[PDB]
Design a protein around this motif. Structure first.
Motif, PDB file in Angstrom:
ATOM      1  N   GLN A   1     -25.243  15.068  22.796  1.00  0.00           N
ATOM      2  CA  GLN A   1     -24.616  14.366  21.687  1.00  0.00           C
ATOM      3  C   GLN A   1     -25.697  13.703  20.845  1.00  0.00           C
ATOM      4  O   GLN A   1     -26.625  13.096  21.389  1.00  0.00           O
ATOM      5  N   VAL A   2     -25.602  13.815  19.529  1.00  0.00           N
ATOM      6  CA  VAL A   2     -26.694  13.458  18.632  1.00  0.00           C
ATOM      7  C   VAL A   2     -26.404  12.116  17.981  1.00  0.00           C
ATOM      8  O   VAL A   2     -25.283  11.860  17.528  1.00  0.00           O
ATOM      9  N   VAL A   3     -27.424  11.267  17.911  1.00  0.00           N
ATOM     10  CA  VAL A   3     -27.305   9.922  17.363  1.00  0.00           C
ATOM     11  C   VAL A   3     -28.162   9.841  16.114  1.00  0.00           C
ATOM     12  O   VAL A   3     -29.351  10.169  16.150  1.00  0.00           O
ATOM     13  N   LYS A   4     -27.560   9.397  15.020  1.00  0.00           N
ATOM     14  CA  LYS A   4     -28.272   9.270  13.762  1.00  0.00           C
ATOM     15  C   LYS A   4     -28.996   7.937  13.708  1.00  0.00           C
ATOM     16  O   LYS A   4     -28.429   6.894  14.040  1.00  0.00           O
ATOM     17  N   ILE A   5     -30.242   7.965  13.247  1.00  0.00           N
ATOM     18  CA  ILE A   5     -31.059   6.768  13.133  1.00  0.00           C
ATOM     19  C   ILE A   5     -31.449   6.592  11.675  1.00  0.00           C
ATOM     20  O   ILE A   5     -31.945   7.526  11.036  1.00  0.00           O
ATOM     21  N   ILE A   6     -31.230   5.389  11.160  1.00  0.00           N
ATOM     22  CA  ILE A   6     -31.574   5.023   9.795  1.00  0.00           C
ATOM     23  C   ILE A   6     -32.608   3.915   9.878  1.00  0.00           C
ATOM     24  O   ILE A   6     -32.321   2.839  10.417  1.00  0.00           O
TER      25      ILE A   6
ATOM     26  N   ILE B   1     -33.965   8.828   7.427  1.00  0.00           N
ATOM     27  CA  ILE B   1     -32.923   9.144   8.395  1.00  0.00           C
ATOM     28  C   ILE B   1     -33.450  10.217   9.331  1.00  0.00           C
ATOM     29  O   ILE B   1     -33.978  11.236   8.875  1.00  0.00           O
ATOM     30  N   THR B   2     -33.305   9.990  10.632  1.00  0.00           N
ATOM     31  CA  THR B   2     -33.702  10.949  11.651  1.00  0.00           C
ATOM     32  C   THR B   2     -32.568  11.090  12.659  1.00  0.00           C
ATOM     33  O   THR B   2     -31.599  10.327  12.645  1.00  0.00           O
ATOM     34  N   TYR B   3     -32.689  12.070  13.552  1.00  0.00           N
ATOM     35  CA  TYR B   3     -31.660  12.352  14.539  1.00  0.00           C
ATOM     36  C   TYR B   3     -32.285  12.516  15.911  1.00  0.00           C
ATOM     37  O   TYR B   3     -33.406  13.006  16.046  1.00  0.00           O
ATOM     38  N   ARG B   4     -31.531  12.130  16.932  1.00  0.00           N
ATOM     39  CA  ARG B   4     -32.008  12.191  18.304  1.00  0.00           C
ATOM     40  C   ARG B   4     -30.893  12.717  19.185  1.00  0.00           C
ATOM     41  O   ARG B   4     -29.823  12.109  19.260  1.00  0.00           O
ATOM     42  N   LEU B   5     -31.145  13.831  19.859  1.00  0.00           N
ATOM     43  CA  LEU B   5     -30.176  14.405  20.775  1.00  0.00           C
ATOM     44  C   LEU B   5     -30.357  13.780  22.148  1.00  0.00           C
ATOM     45  O   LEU B   5     -31.472  13.735  22.672  1.00  0.00           O
ATOM     46  N   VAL B   6     -29.265  13.309  22.729  1.00  0.00           N
ATOM     47  CA  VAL B   6     -29.319  12.719  24.058  1.00  0.00           C
ATOM     48  C   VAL B   6     -29.519  13.831  25.075  1.00  0.00           C
ATOM     49  O   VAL B   6     -28.828  14.855  25.037  1.00  0.00           O
ATOM     50  N   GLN B   7     -30.471  13.636  25.980  1.00  0.00           N
ATOM     51  CA  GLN B   7     -30.741  14.603  27.036  1.00  0.00           C
ATOM     52  C   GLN B   7     -31.805  14.065  27.983  1.00  0.00           C
ATOM     53  O   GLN B   7     -32.971  14.454  27.904  1.00  0.00           O
TER      54      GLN B   7
END
Length: 209
Positions: free
Chosen positions: A188-193, A203-209
């Motif tokens: 599940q991907v979390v958006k970072i601002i 804005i970047t994105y980080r996939l949980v794993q």
DNA sequence: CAAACACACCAAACACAAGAGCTAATTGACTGGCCGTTATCGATGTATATATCTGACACGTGCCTGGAGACTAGGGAGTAATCCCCTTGGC
């Protein structure tokens, strides 16, 4: 102590309310930012063997759009919570269709308890938080930027836009305090601002794993 | 009581220690057994050098045979006279 314990309980409750609101569950604008005075006047301000006793201030809140989805917030009295307590909690949860919950343990639960917690995972999601970790709301911190849990549709939209395999996105382990705060889980991907000092915003994105 | 995991402690290793650049000098294996070549010690001579003995030639001494010397004894060879036998000679 009495006064300090009441203050701690009020802070924990405020933190949990802010958390539920951040996740999406509807909450009163009142209880979201209720001072401590009304807290005393509501419960009794005598935690030391008195009215404001744990397990009585639990709160059940339903999701914003899905009124059918709720989640408990227990507060076991056992400093070293066992499995019997979680066992009875889950049993009593089973009566309703609720699936999610949130445990506030005084001190760290025994390792035997975590095994049981994960075991019931696919059927009843339940996670734990140390009160010491709830006395402060990290998401307000200056360093911690603003997170936004993304929906599956937009995650697919992003991956299809950048032609990038979700395995190639940055990672963020579930154990991370922000992850546990938002309740995100694997895959599940979390958006970072972030405020960018050279680009204003980034804005970047980080996939949980 | 036995088994699960967690924590603190003890004990055991890994790898790193900027980029490099130039010049000099210290180390150049060694006892022993054994085979293989070759130098040395030894026998078994045949050739040449030297010593002893035998044989032929040479100079020298010698024993023996026959020859030679001085002297002697006494008689063989030999003058000086004589006779007259016999020869040469003659008519």
């Amino acid at each position: 102590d009495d006064e300090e314990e009441t203050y701690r309980l009020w802070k924990i409750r405020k933190t949990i309310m802010q958390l539920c609101h951040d996740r999406g569950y509807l909450v009163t604008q009142d209880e979201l930012d209720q001072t401590l005075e009304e807290f005393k006047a509501q419960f009794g301000d005598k935690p030391s063997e008195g009215r404001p006793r744990r397990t009585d201030l639990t709160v059940l809140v339903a999701h914003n759009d899905d009124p059918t989805d709720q989640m408990f917030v227990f507060f076991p009295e056992e400093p070293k919570v066992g499995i019997k307590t979680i066992k009875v909690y889950c049993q009593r949860m089973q009566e309703e269709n609720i699936t999610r919950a949130l445990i506030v343990v005084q001190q760290g639960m025994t390792p035997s308890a975590k095994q049981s917690l994960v075991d019931m995972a696919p059927k009843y999601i339940l996670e734990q938080f140390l009160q010491q970790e709830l006395l402060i709301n990290i998401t307000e911190h200056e360093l911690v930027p603003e997170h936004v849990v993304m929906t599956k549709e937009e995650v697919t939209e992003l991956l299809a836009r950048y032609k990038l395999r979700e395995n190639q996105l940055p990672r963020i382990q579930a154990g991370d305090p922000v992850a546990r705060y938002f309740g995100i889980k694997r895959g599940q991907v979390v958006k970072i601002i972030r405020p960018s000092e050279t680009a204003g915003r980034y804005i970047t994105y980080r996939l949980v794993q």
